[PDB]
Design a protein around this ligand. Structure first.
Ligand SMILES: [Ca+2]
Ligand SMILES: [Ca+2]
Ligand SMILES: [Cu+2]
Ligand SMILES: [Cu+2]
Lengths: 720, 718
C-alpha cells in the first residue's frame, strides 16, 4: 500500500520542495531536514544516511511513498532535536492524565455541581529551594505533586488543592467576593441570550438593522465604578458590544454604536440595555484576508539548518549553547521560563528561577456609553494560554523554527492539546562583535539569538511575545501587537464633515464613519531573577554631570550617583532610560571585585509612542484598581502566591490586590530573594495605515549581565 | 580547463558539494547556481543554462572551462544587476572624473606641491532638476561638476571644477578653517614621536624599556579659548600612547598621563604634558581569537534560489514599492536619494536625500589624557574613507549582496572599497496577523530591506542600517562595537586603595583598566519631502483631560495638536510619548487627513539613553556642538547646510552647524524642510565589554502617518 507523497506530507505539516534538475525532494519539518531522490534506497536526514526498504516512486510526474515513510524518516532518531527525559523535572506542567485525575478527585466531593467549570487547573508551585536543588544537584523532590484546581460554581470561586501522588483532596475553600474570569462558554451564552431578547431585537431594528440574526456580540468585563454604572456588585455580569456581519469576514468593521447590553450570566438574561444616539452602521466591505486582493508574486527565501539544530529539547528542558531552561505552559499567562542557568566554564550559574508574563491591560480613553468601562485584562480576565493562537508555519515564525505542542485543561476539565503553541528558533542577529584595526586582518563573529515565541489572541487583538536568549548572557523580552482595531461608528466620512471634530476627540478617523479610539497597551512581566544566587539587592546608578574639581580646562565631568534601594515603596518607580538599575548579588563578585549583577531595562524601545504611565486621572477607578499601570519597575520579596500584577481575581475588583498590595508593606529588599516586575506600555493613537488590519508593532525590554562575567562572554574557550 | 574550487574561491563564490544528489551549489551575491558533473545544462536562479563544456571530475576534483565563470555568472540569468543607460544625476564621481578633477586643479598656477585633498565629491545639480529626472525622466541640463577641497600644508582651499568643459570655475582659500585629519597624519605623528629624544626620555620614566614598542594615536585638540595653552593658527594634534606587547591589542596597554602635542607643519612635538606615573597594564588581552577555540556550530544558510526581489541599476535600487539611489561620500558614507514609494502605480516622494549628518563620541574625565577627548568621527576623520569592508556572512547575513564603492583618497587617487555596503532582505516576523476565534487564520510575513555600512575610526567600529519596510516605514539603526578607550589605573580590584578615585569617571573593567564614561551621539540629516516639497511640522501631544461628556469617567485621552512654525521652536527635546509629524498641508488621504510622516528620533536602544549632552552648558564642546543637546531639529532646505557639527569642525571656535542653521526666525510653514535627528547613548562600561564590546544598538523610525488610506501591505485590489 502506498500514498501520494505530496498530499500526505502536507497533511503532516512538512514543507515539500521538488528540484527537477537535481531530481531531488527536500522535505523540512521542525528539526528534520530531509533529502530524497525517487528510486533511491537511501534518504538523508540531517546529513545522515537512512536506509529505505521502499524507495520514493515517481509515476506520471507524481510521487508516491509507503504508508510507513513519514514515521520511518521523521521519527528515525537521526533528527536529534528532541530527546527523552530520564527523570521528570518537578516543574513539568500537569499531563493530560494528571488533569483528568484532578478533575475526578474534585468531582468525588458532594459539593461538585454539573454546571461547575474550571477557571484554572495547574501544578501547585513546588518548593523553590528543592526545585533549584533538582536543577543544579539532581536532588529528587520529596514532596508530592499537587494541582491547584480553581472552580467557578455558578458565580462563586472555590479553590481546591489535590494531592496527585496520593489521589486525595487536600482542601476546598470558597473565596468570598471573588468574581471568576470569562470562560469560553460565556461567549456562546451572551450571543444566545441576545438572539433570544425581544427587547434587544427591537433596539437593533431602530438603528437600521433589518436582520437581527446577523448581529455579532463580543463580551466585555464591566469593571467597577462604586455604583455609578448602576450595576450590582454581587452579580456575575458582562457587557456586550455588537457588530453587524456583512459577509466580509470582518465584523469588527461594522460597529452598532451606542448600544450596550448588560447580561447576567446566572439568570441568563439581559438585565439592562443602555442606549445612546443612533449612528448608522458603517456598511462598506473591509476584508483583511485577501479575498479582494491580488496575490503577491514573491521569490522564495528559506532559512535552513541542514544538519539539524544547535538546541536540544529534552522533555521541556531546552539546552542551547551556555543556556539551560525549563519551558512550560499555563492557561492564564502562557509560557513560563524556569530554572534558567548560564554555564560559565562548567559551573551552571543561576540567572532566573521563574519568568513569565505577569499580566496585561488594554484600557480605552473614550467616555461614551460603549467605551467608558472598556479595558481588556487579557490574561487575567480571558486566559491568554487558553487563547493561544497556533503558529502559522513560516509566517508567524521563520521557516527554520521548531513548533511545540502544549497541553492545558479546558474550562470543563478536559485536556486540550494546543498545536504549534510555541515556536523555538535560532536567528542570525548581525555581528556579535567586530574590530577592523587599520592595516590588520579583520575580526568579526556572528551573533546568534535563541527566540521562544508565543502568540495569544483575545477578541480583536493578537499579541506576540518573544523571549530572546542571547549567546552573551543578555535576555530580551519583546511584545508585539497586531490584529483588528476596536473602532467607533461615527457620522463623519472625512475630516471636512460637520461632526468630524467631535467624532475624533478621542481617536483618529481611520476610515469613512470609523474612528480608532485611543487606548494604551500595557504589559507587565514577572521576573524572579536569582542573580548567581537567591540573595540579591536593588542598586541604582544615575549618570550625572558634576562640576570638575580636578583642575584643567573642563568645567564638568561625568560621574555616577550610586545607592541601594532598600525598601519596596522606593523600588516601585518610573524608569528613566538614562539611568541604570541593577539587581546585584552583594555576596558574589567578579574578578575586579564588582558585585555580579543584571541590568534591568523595562524600556528598550518600541514602534508606537511610549506610555510614561497610565493615561487616566488618579481619581479613576481603573487607576486605583491597577497600580501596575503607572510605574515601570517594581521589586518585591519572593512569595509563591504573588504572581499577577493585577491581582488574582481582577474581575470587578474594588481595590488593588496585585502589585499595589504586594509592594505596600515596608519590608526590606536588602540581600534577600527579590522578584522584579517590569511594566512597559504604549499609547496607541491610530492611523489609516493600521486599518483594516494593524501591521505588527513592537516594544522591547532587556536584562543584561552587568559585571556578572569577567570579560567579553562570547570570546570562546581559553586555549591556555 | 581550470580547477573549479580554486577558481570559484578566487572569484569570491561559495562552493557546496552534495554527494547524495551529486550536485554543486555555487553562491555569489545574487547568483544561485546548481550544476551536476557531466550535465550539459546548469541552473542559474531557477533558469536553465546550456553549457559549452560540462563540469568534469578528475580524481574527485571538479574542473571547469576557463570561461565557466563568465558563461554562468555573467550569463544574464542573474538579474540582480541591470545596466544603467541614462545615468542618474546624483551618481558619485567615477574614477575617471576623480582623476580629471585632480588634473584640472593641478593645472592651476595656484596649486602648490604636496597639496592634499580632504574631499573630492559631486557638486550636485539643483534639487528640482534631480527630482524631475527621477519622476519624469527629464534630462538635467547641467555639466558634471566637482567640489575639490584641498589642504595646502595647513591651509584649506575650496575649488569647483566643471568636468564636461574641463575647466576650473572657482578657487577660494577658506580663512581660519582647519582641515580634517588625513591618513599621512597618522604616520607623521608616529614618526615624530619615534624621533623625539624628549619623548623617549619621558616614556623611559614610565617604565617602558623599548621606546620603539610605543603606538601613537592622533586626536584632535578642540578649542578652549587658550586655556589648553594651544595656539589657534597652528595645525595641531594631541597624541595618546599605548604599549605594544604583541597581543594584537595595543588599546589594552595605555601609557596614562602622557600627552604630546604635535605641530604637523613644523613636524615636531611642541608640548609634552606629564602627569603622575601609572604602570602600564601589561597582561595580554587579544580580541582576535589567537588564544581561543570557538564551539562547533551547525550550519545555517539563508537562501534565495531564484535570485533577489531587488534590482540594482547603476546605483538605483528597486525593491517592492521602494525606489532610491545609493551613493558613497568620503565624509559621511552612504547617501540615500530620490526615495519614492510606489502607491498603486504612482511614485510618491518620501525623501530627497538622507544620510549620516555627523557624530560625536565625547568623554567625561577631566584628566590630562582625557579632557579634550572627543571623536568627531565623520567630520574630523572621514568615515567613508574609513569604511570597513563587510566580512561576508558575519557582518551581514549569508543572503546579502555586497557592493563595491569608489571615492578619492587624500592624494587624489581613486580608491575602490571592496564590499563597502551590504544589501539584504530579511524575514522580520509577521507583517500582520489575525486569528479570529473559530475561523481560518490570516498571517503574512514581514520583509525588510536593509542597507548596511560599517566604518571604523581608531578603536570603535560603527554599523549603520537603513531599513526599508514594505509598509512604508523607514528605520535607521546605529550599532557600536570595537575596543573601548581605557584609562590606566593602579587599582586591580575595587578592594584596592585607589579604586574609588580610579573609578570616579568610569567602571573598572579589568585589572588596572578603567572604561572611561562617555557618550555616543549620532545625527542623521533627512531631507524628507512628504509627498512633495512643501511641508509643515505638526505636534500631537497625547494628554489626559477631564471628561465633559458625562457618565462615570472622570478623565479622557485626547490630543493637543499644534503647528511648529519657526526653526527656533523646532529645535527640541524629543519626548517619546509625543508624536511629531512632517505633514504636507496641501495633500490629504481619503479621510481628509494631511499626508504625513511620523519622526521618531528615539525608538530605543541597548545602552542607557542620552537625554542630551552630559556637559555643563559652559563647556566648549557644548558651545561648539549644539546638535548634541536636542533630538529633533527642522531647518529650511539649503544645499550647503549638510553637517550638524559644521563644515570645518576641527578647532572650531563657534557652532557653524545646526546652531547656525536653526538660529534665524524664518518660517517652517508650508515650505521645504529638512529634519535632523540626534540620538545618543551614555556608555557606562562593564567587564562584559572588554577586551571587545558586543555590538550595542540604537533605533530610530520614520513611519507613514495617514500617508496612505489603508494597510499598505494588503496588496492591490482585484
Ligand atoms: Ca529572586
Ligand atoms: Ca524637504
Ligand atoms: Cu492598539
Ligand atoms: Cu562607548
Amino acid at each position: 500500500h502506498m500514498v501520494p507523497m505530496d498530499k500526505t506530507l502536507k497533511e503532516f505539516g512538512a514543507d515539500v520542495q521538488w528540484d527537477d534538475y537535481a531530481q531531488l525532494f527536500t522535505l523540512i519539518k521542525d528539526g528534520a531536514y530531509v533529502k530524497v531522490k525517487p528510486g533511491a534506497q537511501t534518504a538523508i536526514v540531517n546529513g545522515q544516511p537512512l536506509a529505505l526498504q521502499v524507495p520514493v516512486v515517481m509515476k506520471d510526474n507524481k510521487a508516491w511513498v509507503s504508508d510507513t515513510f513519514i514515521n520511518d524518516v521523521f521519527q528515525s532518531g537521526l533528527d536529534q532535536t528532541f530527546q527523552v527525559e530520564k527523570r521528570p523535572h518537578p516543574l513539568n506542567a500537569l499531563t493530560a492524565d494528571e488533569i483528568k485525575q484532578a478533575v475526578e478527585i474534585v468531582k468525588a466531593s458532594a459539593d461538585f455541581k454539573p454546571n461547575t467549570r474550571f477557571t484554572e487547573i495547574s501544578l501547585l508551585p513546588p518548593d523553590k529551594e528543592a526545585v533549584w536543588a533538582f536543577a543544579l544537584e539532581n536532588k529528587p523532590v520529596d514532596q508530592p505533586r499537587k494541582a491547584d484546581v480553581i472552580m467557578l460554581d455558578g458565580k462563586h470561586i472555590i479553590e481546591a488543592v489535590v494531592d496527585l501522588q496520593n489521589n486525595k483532596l487536600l482542601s476546598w475553600q470558597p473565596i468570598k467576593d471573588a468574581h471568576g474570569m470569562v470562560l469560553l462558554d460565556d461567549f456562546a451564552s451572551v450571543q444566545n441570550i441576545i438572539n433570544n431578547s425581544e427587547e434587544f431585537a427591537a433596539a437593533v431594528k431602530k438603528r437600521g438593522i433589518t436582520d437581527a440574526k446577523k448581529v455579532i456580540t463580543t463580551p466585555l468585563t464591566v469593571g467597577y465604578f462604586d455604583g455609578k454604572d448602576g450595576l450590582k456588585q454581587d452579580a456575575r455580569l458582562l457587557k456586550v458590544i455588537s457588530y453587524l456581519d456583512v459577509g466580509d469576514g470582518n465584523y469588527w468593521a461594522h460597529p452598532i454604536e451606542n448600544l450596550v447590553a448588560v447580561v447576567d450570566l446566572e439568570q441568563k438574561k439581559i438585565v439592562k440595555i443602555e442606549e445612546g444616539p443612533v449612528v448608522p452602521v458603517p456598511m462598506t466591505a473591509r476584508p483583511f484576508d485577501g479575498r479582494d486582493r491580488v496575490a503577491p508574486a514573491v521569490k522564495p527565501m528559506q532559512i535552513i539548518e541542514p544538519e539539524g539544530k544547535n538546541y536540544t529539547i529534552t522533555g521541556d528542558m531546552i539546552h542551547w549553547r551556555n543556556w539551560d531552561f525549563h519551558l512550560s505552559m499555563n492557561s492564564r499567562v502562557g509560557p513560563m521560563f524556569s530554572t534558567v542557568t548560564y554555564n560559565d566554564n562548567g559551573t551552571k550559574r543561576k540567572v532566573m528561577y521563574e519568568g513569565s508574563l505577569g499580566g496585561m491591560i488594554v484600557p480605552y480613553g473614550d467616555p461614551d456609553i460603549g467605551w467608558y468601562f472598556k479595558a481588556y485584562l487579557d490574561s487575567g480576565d480571558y486566559g491568554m494560554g487558553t487563547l493561544t493562537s497556533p503558529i502559522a508555519r513560516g509566517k508567524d515564525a521563520p521557516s527554520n523554527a521548531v513548533l511545540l505542542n502544549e497541553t492545558i485543561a479546558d474550562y470543563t476539565g478536559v485536556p486540550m492539546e494546543i498545536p504549534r503553541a510555541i515556536a523555538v528558533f535560532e536567528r542570525y542577529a548581525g555581528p556579535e562583535y567586530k574590530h577592523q584595526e587599520m592595516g590588520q586582518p579583520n575580526v568579526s563573529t556572528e551573533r546568534r539569538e535563541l527566540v521562544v515565541r508565543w502568540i495569544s489572541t483575545v477578541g480583536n487583538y493578537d499579541y506576540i511575545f518573544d523571549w530572546i536568549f542571547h549567546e552573551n548572557g543578555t535576555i530580551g523580552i519583546d511584545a508585539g501587537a497586531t490584529g483588528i482595531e476596536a473602532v467607533k461608528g461615527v457620522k463623519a466620512k472625512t475630516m471636512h464633515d460637520e461632526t468630524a471634530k467631535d467624532d475624533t476627540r478621542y481617536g483618529t478617523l481611520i476610515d469613512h464613519n470609523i474612528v480608532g479610539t485611543t487606548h494604551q497597551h500595557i504589559y507587565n512581566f514577572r521576573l524572579d531573577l536569582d542573580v548567581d544566587g537567591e540573595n540579591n539587592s536593588l542598586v541604582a546608578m544615575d549618570p550625572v554631570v558634576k562640576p570638575n574639581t580636578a583642575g584643567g580646562p573642563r568645567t564638568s565631568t561625568m560621574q555616577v550617583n550610586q545607592y541601594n534601594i532598600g525598601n519596596q515603596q522606593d523600588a516601585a518607580q518610573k524608569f528613566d532610560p538614562g539611568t541604570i538599575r541593577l539587581l546585584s548579588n552583594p555576596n558574589k563578585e567578579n574578578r575586579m571585585g564588582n558585585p555580579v549583577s543584571y541590568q534591568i531595562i523595562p524600556y528598550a524601545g518600541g514602534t508606537h509612542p511610549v506610555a510614561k504611565g497610565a493615561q487616566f486621572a488618579p481619581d479613576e477607578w481603573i487607576y486605583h484598581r491597577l497600580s501596575f499601570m503607572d510605574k515601570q519597575l517594581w521589586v518585591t520579596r519572593y512569595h509563591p502566591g504573588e504572581r499577577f500584577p493585577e491581582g488574582k481575581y481582577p474581575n470587578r475588583s474594588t481595590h488593588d490586590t496585585g502589585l499595589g498590595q504586594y509592594s505596600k508593606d515596608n519590608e526590606s529588599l536588602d540581600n534577600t530573594d527579590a522578584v522584579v516586575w517590569m511594566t512597559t506600555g504604549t499609547t496607541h493613537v491610530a492611523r489609516a495605515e493600521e486599518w483594516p488590519i494593524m501591521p505588527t508593532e513592537w516594544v522591547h525590554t532587556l536584562l543584561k549581565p552587568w559585571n556578572f562575567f569577567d570579560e567579553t562572554p562570547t570570546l570562546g574557550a581559553l586555549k591556555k
